[PDB]
Amino acid sequence: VLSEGEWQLVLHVWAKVEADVAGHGQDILIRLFKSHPETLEKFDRFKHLKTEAEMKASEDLKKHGVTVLTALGAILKKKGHHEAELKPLAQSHATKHKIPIKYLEFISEAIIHVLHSRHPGDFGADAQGAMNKALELWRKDIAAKYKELGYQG
Numbered sequence: 001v002l003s004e005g006e007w008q009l010v011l012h013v014w015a016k017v018e019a020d021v022a023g024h025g026q027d028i029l030i031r032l033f034k035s036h037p038e039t040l041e042k043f044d045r046f047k048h049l050k051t052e053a054e055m056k057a058s059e060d061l062k063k064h065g066v067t068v069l070t071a072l073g074a075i076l077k078k079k080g081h082h083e084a085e086l087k088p089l090a091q092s093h094a095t096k097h098k099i100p101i102k103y104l105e106f107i108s109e110a111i112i113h114v115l116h117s118r119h120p121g122d123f124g125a126d127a128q129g130a131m132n133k134a135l136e137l138w139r140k141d142i143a144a145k146y147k148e149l150g151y152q153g
């Protein structure tokens with residue numbers, strides 16, 4: 001469980017993310033694909049992008065980044081009371097896209113990296129710890145929902 005103060009640190013940084021959702025999302029997906037190239041293979045619509053510049057120019061990757069961050073943000077804002085937000089995400093990600101939890105770990109590392117890179121002054125050790133705990137809670141709860149659907153990834 002996170003403390004109220006941990007939630008507040010999470011939400012304080014997230015408000016900085018919301019000043020430029022698209023740009024944060026591009027930076028996070030690009031970092032994910034740079035750091036863990038296997039993850040790009042799950043995206044039929046993006047795996048043809050061969051260079052960082054092509055990835056930045058891609059309207060569809062940028063749109064997808066906003067979709068991703070909007071969903072994550074809606075989950076974080078519920079401060080752990082996220083069943084209704086999380087269920088549909090678990091359904092698609094378990095049964096259609098087939099995203100293992102290790103891949104959710106990789107995108108969590110990309111989120112942390114981008115947030116620190118863009119907001120170091122609002123993303124020191126206590127705020128990083130709080131964000132890591134919020135993302136761990138989300139991954140724990142998504143894994144339980146994966147198993148309820150029969151997916152052991």
Ligand code: HEM
Pocket residue numbers: 039040042043044045067068069071072088089092093097099103104107
């Ligand atoms: C913070 C973590 C993530 C969030 C909040 C998230 C959110 C979303 C949302 C909202 C969609 C659109 C609706 C749906 O199909 O569920 C989506 C689609 C998708 N996600 Fe994720 N996602 C996350 C992580 C990942 C990761 C790590 C992968 C792959 C390594 C992945 C692969 C996909 C694929 C392949 C689609 C369909 C893309 C398309 O063709 O339109 N997701 N995701």
